[PDB]
Subunit: 387 residues, 4 copies
């Protein structure tokens, strides 16, 4: 039961199942995986595709001949399995040169290098068929107040993204960008810390249509925010270009638990929203099998990500299809929320005594919302306990 | 020392010093204050002005004659003291009719009433000389996932703000709107939970130039975010129309401590930013004297808000003026952060071997940022411990 | 399905279903309930009993004749329904006199009054058959560092609890005390903020056997802590005298959502632990139907608390009884965790080369824990998705 | 100004200034330091001593001859500088063998090895003159609910600490143990997550007098708790055997900022408490110079830890010595908080009409606490802005 299919579009970063287990306090617990291995194992589990940072696929500093051989082997694995590559990204965070940032490093020479490193990888992403290029500015930020003038840093971040937009336009590429917010870690505070801040920034770019967001479940939860609500705002803005799925237990370091772990009810409401809205992009997992696990546990954890999505999809669909739930949604006036407040226009509203002089506020205030009954129907559907 | 002056533009809500001390668990500890009393006492402390919700100035449900008398008494107090009214707002949160929201209530009749209540108070705000009209949507949100379709709620919130913009345009008013984000409390999650989400929403309004943000120190800190960073993004966007100053100890219920309490170093960096950027708006305190206090403690707490701003202003100015700090800022390459990455343009960057093939990444990575020395100079300046 | 029974021992505070909906920003949305009404309605839902603060049952300041009549009516309702009263507590937080505390108020006269108010209610609790007397020191704490010397406050808190222990001993009562920790709210920081701090404090009382803890799901989660882990430590110490069940979405104001809401997987692990350990006390709900609800929603929310406990009980029992789970627990060495490290004793351990010179650390480190497979079996059982 | 002296007893872990800068996302930015270098540089800054994990001083897996040479070189550096070694600890977290714990690993063979590794290092600590042996159980915990039975784990943790107590008793050593709590990171939840939980656990050990706590500023703040309050409870219990000083910005990953950074006002209240209580132990810094820094920044950050302690010490002493503050403390009834509630005894309290029938609750409730004036005097003293 709950078998993944190609239409599910489940994808995984090479760095997810390939995470060797090094953490702030501990050495690696697993050997490095060949990307070819990961592609073949993920395909066996029913995944649709993989994603990569440049330096996951091609060791940093590789010669041109080494680069070609790494890409050739990877493409053979994709061809052998039918796996796709819908998204790629640049590693602008691991190497010590990026310790103060890539695009917003105080040192101008580093900013220029970061752009050249990204541009090289955009070319590769396009060659592999990627539709989306993600940017996670994990080093953009500060530990202290004097170290980073945020207005200047935002100017540099806009300059960088504008140059990348000019680049893809000039080459005729169809790829689009997706900015991944995170509030903190590894920097004390990261620039563009939430979906909202990233959406606001995009509106000030020269070609805003080329950029959207790549929100990650756990990153919004590291600020204690409601991830389904943030995804709803991204959808409302037309900017949900990609998504990263995982789990998180609240306001902690970024745990990258398998999807469904962490806040299970938020995972339910997320799947309900994505499916109801008809989100058509990859269901991408940015997760880490815990370092307690051997490789069998790696593949079990990856399988669990997909399984949990499919269980939640079933339960959310049953919730929305249940005539008792539909009745409860009407009892709670969800239908009214979807109707305009004043399609009659401002003057008609100003002239409407039913909106002011003759509005019976105490009668309105007496009406219950019936939200608790609705939520217990949702709980019963999630748990398969209807009756 | 540290005496407030009119040019400081310190303002207070009537509901701040007037808070009677009722909390989720406790009855009022202070009697209600007449707004006339608050105006006269605040003026004696050196405040510039006050702000109000409609229902702070005019008891809910007042007749037209009662409304006129309340406003007349208030205006006499303003005239007697020279106090100004730079900002006003609507109470769309206390009355039970607003239990599911004002502008985004599921019930359409409530949404229409909320708009009419706001419009009436915009007229009054203009008559009193206010330049800014704040909206704090404290009831816009949910405790459960099925209760509120966030895309529909954002449609209703946009409709409401668009109607208000049409209204002020039609009347020829110069007032502008400022949206106040908050992540949670009193709703389990509030819509537009951060400065970023509010900035992003504004970009989708029909007349975006009429709307900005009113960020509150403690509200961003309730999501664990960096308040100076968020203010920097608002300034970068040209949207810092007003600000609410207070203190908060991290991720808790909204404490509304006096300004300078809570995160003292964030208060320092905030004042440094506002003064450096030339922010010209009110320095408004949205705070609550703790319910442990009698009226003498109320006025001491209000005085403390202003005193702490003025101490921090002095220390931040001394930091920026110190030639040793200026040298440290150059050692940390803050000057370089302010210079364009690639004013030479994209083609020149692509052709520049110094940005890629000839970039010595290990030499760049060896350079220290000297951020710790800079931050200890900042600490020494804040504490008056230079030497 | 999932029908409560008397053996379930589900109990509710009068103040839960009776909460009128006043919050930091909003007036009451529901009329006050007569305790008689609440007893009869809760009995109809299958509850076992109720609990009370003194001032929930007897209006503050009542005459002796008024007190007798309130108690008489309440006892008739208990007799009419078969409902029990297993626990009572004192309200040392609502009245303004308690604004700086009860037992740890700086003013000695207030401390003495708080003790007398508690003692009067202990007598009533015993008359009603209560086995446990809870103390929630919600006003014990501070908003500022100079206001409360915590060592002195702990001396006063110990003195108070020691006097209460002397009192019950002197009267021959069998009741025992349960201290309810909370980290913050309504005070900026509350003394004894977690289960651990309360357990540690109890060990320093003169008669430690008379005191245990009353942990509340949401209160531990307001510090981001793992509630099942804290309950395990209380059980390990022999101190889980009572428990408060509800839901919470992380590090926020105390939400008091119905049980099962908030962190659903933590609710699952909690029920698993209570049932596995054979906890025999009340399953008490300290929750608040949201103020959006009318009375039908109040009773739906209360019913939901019990329903969710019973669903989770079923799923946790099925998890523990499944031979595949039992095999997975052995694969993860849970059996070994339960066996002594060194029952052979210290000298034998020091002499055992297999524990040091001949311990193959790399072979040990290669063994996977298989925790992800185990956790996905747990997820499948919770969701009823085995297969 | 603010020059460290030997009587200040400032100490640093080898792993602090020696941290190479590897974080969850980034490679090392600094070369490894020879412990001899660190000892000599710290002495030049005015430090009193250093501390070590076994594997900081002796590379894991060293032969006996290698071990002797590493210790010999280190002792020569201590002798050359006058530096002391007041504390040592075991690394039971970095090596992959400890991925599920040391003392509470599910695998019994790992638990036995962890004990033998610790015992070997206790012998070395005693030879170097250490008075305290710290245990930070960073791997004791879980990411999932089924992986760790917490009651069984607490049994194993007690067994381990009891064996270590038997060991030191049998050898006649004067060293004592200090347990370092942390709520999470690197495990999803760590056992003994706060000072309170550790204090409670110690009370159940066979020889409780041999064990205390080593609280760390940032770790309590990772649960949003008040660090000075927790230190006060440890002092009240007689269990503050050692302390780790650093800074933290709230509920995030463990930042280990230099002391004084993070929550500056909490640092002030901490220093006030330690100095007022006469804490006589090391002022130990467990911090990490940010990875942005070169070695000059490492030593600047270490110097800053000590400088900030000394500034805060001066300001707290001036606060307590100021006759205006002493008057404000009396106005706020801090003197009364320190006096017994009922030294007259229980019967006298029960017979005292002034404590109940004749207690004027409304007159008592009218008295203000004057806490805001007191706190603004504290702020003025911290900032050196008296006047
Ligand atoms: Mg629709
Ligand atoms: Mg500039
Ligand atoms: Mg057992
Ligand atoms: Mg004393
Ligand atoms: Mn992540
Ligand atoms: Mn991601
Ligand atoms: Mn606020
Ligand atoms: Mn505000
Ligand atoms: Mn609660
Ligand atoms: Mn409770
Ligand atoms: Mn730490
Ligand atoms: Mn430490
Ligand atoms: Na700039
Ligand atoms: Na979209
Ligand atoms: Na709509
Ligand atoms: Na602006
Ligand atoms: Na005392
Ligand atoms: Na127990
Ligand atoms: Na055991
Ligand atoms: Na002590």
């Amino acid at each position: 039961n709950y078998a993944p299919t190609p239409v599910d579009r489940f994808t995984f970063g090479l760095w997810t199942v390939g995470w060797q287990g090094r953490d702030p306090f501990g050495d690696a617990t697993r050997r490095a995986l060949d990307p070819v291995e990961s592609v073949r194992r993920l395909a066996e589990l029913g995944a649709h595709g993989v994603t990569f940072h440049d330096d996951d696929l091609i060791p940093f500093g590789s010669s041109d001949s080494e680069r070609e051989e790494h890409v050739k082997r990877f493409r053979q694995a994709l061809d052998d399995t039918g796996m796709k590559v819908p998204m790629a990204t640049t590693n602008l965070f691991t190497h010590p040169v990026f310790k103060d940032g890539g695009f917003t490093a105080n040192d101008r020479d580093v900013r220029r290098y970061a752009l050249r490193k990204t541009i090289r990888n955009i070319d590769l992403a396009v060659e592999l068929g990627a539709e989306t290029y993600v940017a996670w500015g994990g080093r953009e930020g500060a530990e202290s107040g004097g170290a980073k003038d945020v207005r200047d840093a935002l100017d540099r971040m806009k300059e960088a993204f504008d140059l990348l937009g000019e680049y893809v336009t000039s080459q005729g590429y169809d790829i689009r960008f997706a900015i991944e917010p995170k509030p903190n870690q590894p920097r004390g505070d990261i620039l563009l810390p939430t979906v909202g801040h990233a959406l606001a920034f995009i509106e000030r770019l020269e070609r805003p249509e080329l950029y959207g967001v790549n929100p990650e479940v756990g990153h919004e939860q590291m600020a204690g925010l409601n991830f389904p609500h943030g995804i709803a705002q991204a959808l409302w803005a037309g900017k949900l270009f990609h998504i990263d799925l995982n789990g998180q237990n609240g306001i902690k370091y970024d745990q990258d638990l398998r999807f469904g772990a962490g806040d299970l009810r938020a995972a339910f409401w997320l799947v309900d929203l994505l499916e109801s809205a008809g989100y058509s992009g990859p269901r991408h997992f940015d997760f880490k099998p815990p370092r307690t696990e051997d490789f069998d546990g790696v593949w079990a954890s990856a399988a669990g990500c997909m399984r949990n999505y499919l269980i939640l999809k079933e339960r959310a669909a049953a919730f929305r299809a249940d005539p008792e739930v539909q009745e409860a949604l009407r009892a709670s006036r969800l239908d009214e929320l979807a109707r305009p407040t004043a399609a009659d226009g401002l003057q008609a509203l100003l002239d409407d005594r039913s909106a002011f002089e003759e509005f019976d506020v105490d009668a309105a205030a007496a009406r219950g919302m019936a939200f608790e009954r609705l939520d217990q129907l949702a709980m019963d559907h999630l748990l398969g306990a209807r009756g």
